[PDB]
Enzyme design. Structure first.
Site, PDB file in Angstrom:
ATOM      1  N   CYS A  52      46.490  44.610  37.288  1.00 38.67           N
ATOM      2  CA  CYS A  52      47.117  45.912  37.225  1.00 38.67           C
ATOM      3  C   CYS A  52      46.302  46.723  38.236  1.00 38.67           C
ATOM      4  O   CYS A  52      45.066  46.760  38.162  1.00 38.67           O
ATOM      5  CB  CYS A  52      47.018  46.505  35.823  1.00 38.67           C
ATOM      6  SG  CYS A  52      47.457  48.268  35.720  1.00 38.67           S
ATOM      7  N   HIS A  79      38.234  47.888  40.544  1.00 42.03           N
ATOM      8  CA  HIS A  79      39.284  47.015  40.033  1.00 42.03           C
ATOM      9  C   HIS A  79      39.340  47.081  38.512  1.00 42.03           C
ATOM     10  O   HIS A  79      38.296  47.189  37.878  1.00 42.03           O
ATOM     11  CB  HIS A  79      39.119  45.579  40.534  1.00 42.03           C
ATOM     12  CG  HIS A  79      39.288  45.463  42.019  1.00 42.03           C
ATOM     13  ND1 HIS A  79      38.502  44.603  42.775  1.00 42.03           N
ATOM     14  CD2 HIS A  79      40.078  46.181  42.856  1.00 42.03           C
ATOM     15  CE1 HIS A  79      38.873  44.796  44.033  1.00 42.03           C
ATOM     16  NE2 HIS A  79      39.821  45.738  44.127  1.00 42.03           N
ATOM     17  N   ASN A 123      33.792  47.619  41.670  1.00 43.23           N
ATOM     18  CA  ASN A 123      34.560  47.404  42.899  1.00 43.23           C
ATOM     19  C   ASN A 123      35.946  48.041  42.835  1.00 43.23           C
ATOM     20  O   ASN A 123      36.853  47.591  43.531  1.00 43.23           O
ATOM     21  CB  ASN A 123      34.688  45.913  43.179  1.00 43.23           C
ATOM     22  CG  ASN A 123      33.352  45.213  43.222  1.00 43.23           C
ATOM     23  OD1 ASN A 123      33.090  44.281  42.456  1.00 43.23           O
ATOM     24  ND2 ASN A 123      32.473  45.657  44.108  1.00 43.23           N
TER      25      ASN A 123
END
Ligand SMILES: CN(C)S(=O)(=O)N1CCOCC1
Ligand SMILES: CN(C)S(=O)(=O)N1CCOCC1
Lengths: 266, 265
Positions: free
Chosen positions: A225, A190, A188
């Site tokens: 992050c 991330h 996704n």
């Protein structure tokens, strides 16, 4: 991979790969972390909770699970070519979040070679911000969980529930300017939680890693992050060797992670 | 994993992992690269190696990758089983070749193929060298005698000369450094890391709207643990073609050069 007889836990075997090992021809702690995450993903899939590991009311309110804490203890890292069996299960922590625990075993002897625990919280999937935990999305998955308390770390006052302090400048050691690449992202887009473990250990001097073995790692996840962020990894010895760790953004100094590691001489 | 009947090739099945996939829920090209390297490693182990011959250890000689060429027709989805077949062929005095064929386990259909060129190098001096006849006879018994090619075509893109990128690059990713996860068991940067670093200068808009079909990468020099690399890319072209150059920040010393071919989803 297969669900156990009572359908309350999942087990899977992994053969250690040539590229998954360190200088001692044994699996790195990051390889172990990815193996824990993979057996977690197949446990959710096997019971019909994968679309993200989510429940029916979570899919409606647009909520996903996110890691808030990861605790791993390794007694023996598996050698290249060895078979490691991992058993995983989940339990609710009331209206505060969920827990996923793991037990790593040597397939040949049945001996426990490590164990992990994790704390998970709810987060709005669209905005990516934290949200409350209600009993509305609780009964829908507790039948796939063990009923009596079952923990990988049952012992009172054990290392997995220890409060972690914030590192004061100046750090004894640092690795500055760390950025994620595409290989560090999940499906996704991330940043993978295992990346933060790697980034944390980058600030540990090589002399330590070459003469010691990592026994315990506790890591708190405060903020994620983003793809375009740049992180500094700080470490100060607090001691067997013990270290205090802090991951923060290069620009503003915003904390993303804090942790502790315990190392033992080879 | 198991050696084939004649003991001249090796096959292995891999189940795709949740963390090995990209935004399309299919294996990334770096995951494929690691799968190729792992089946190469198990083929060397199954025939007696620990890929260095007895004579190579004495002379302090190792095999190093000089080129890697991969073509993917279909990336495996998360949970799918991918069967890979690998084999080696001699290239006389020049070096050796290792080829791969990727197949869907359920249908037996070829979903990709790869080729690699390997050269002999002294570990201490880092100076590349020609293969002696004593070393050549030791590994020749494990290669098919009637050469098997993953890329048979008369003018296949796996043998095409790659030019050097002229400044200014159209695109760039600056300040790339290896972490411990990027190192192999001998504390050296993994060959798959360079593929990742090469693709970092490709704009996200292209990766989100296209699928990577072909990657050719020449390995000129290796990035040490403390080095810092810049990745440069310039479009050279429905189908998109890019010219790539990896170089050190400290002096601009080339470590890699390559080309990639992408196609709209
Ligand atoms: C019950 N599952 C195997 S679970 O632990 O993966 N999970 C519990 C809560 O979130 C949704 C699914
Ligand atoms: C026979 N092996 C599987 S091999 O291909 O790894 N081999 C050829 C190159 O030199 C020695 C090692």
């Amino acid at each position: 991979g297969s669900l156990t007889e009572d359908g309350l836990s999942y087990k899977e075997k992994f053969v250690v790969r040539s590229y998954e090992v360190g200088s001692n021809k044994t699996a790195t702690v990051e390889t172990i972390a990815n193996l824990l995450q993979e057996v977690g993903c197949n446990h959710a899939q096997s019971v019909g909770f994968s679309t993200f590991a989510t429940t029916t009311t979570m899919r409606k309110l647009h909520l996903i699970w996110v890691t808030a804490r990861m605790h791993i203890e390794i007694y023996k890292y598996p050698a290249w070519g060895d078979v490691v069996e991992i058993e995983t299960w989940c339990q609710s922590e009331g209206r505060i979040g969920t827990r996923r625990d793991w037990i790593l075993k040597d397939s040949v002897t049945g001996e426990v070679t490590g164990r992990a625990t994790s704390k998970w919280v709810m987060m709005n999937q669209d905005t990516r911000r934290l949200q409350k935990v209600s009993d509305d999305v609780r009964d829908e998955y507790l039948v796939f969980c063990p009923q009596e308390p079952r923990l990988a770390f049952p012992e009172e006052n054990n290392r997995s529930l220890k409060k972690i302090p914030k590192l004061e400048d100046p750090a004894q050691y640092s690795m500055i300017g760390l950025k994620p690449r595409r290989a560090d992202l999940d499906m996704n887009q991330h940043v993978n939680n295992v990346t933060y473990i790697g980034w944390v250990l980058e600030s540990i001097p090589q002399e330590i890693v070459d003469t010691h073995e990592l026994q315990v790692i506790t890591l708190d996840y405060r903020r994620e992050c983003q793809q375009d962020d740049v992180v500094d990894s700080l470490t100060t010895t607090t001691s067997d060797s013990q270290f205090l760790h802090l991951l923060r953004l290069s620009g503003d100094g915003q904390e993303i992670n804090r942790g502790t590691t315990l190392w033992r001489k080879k």
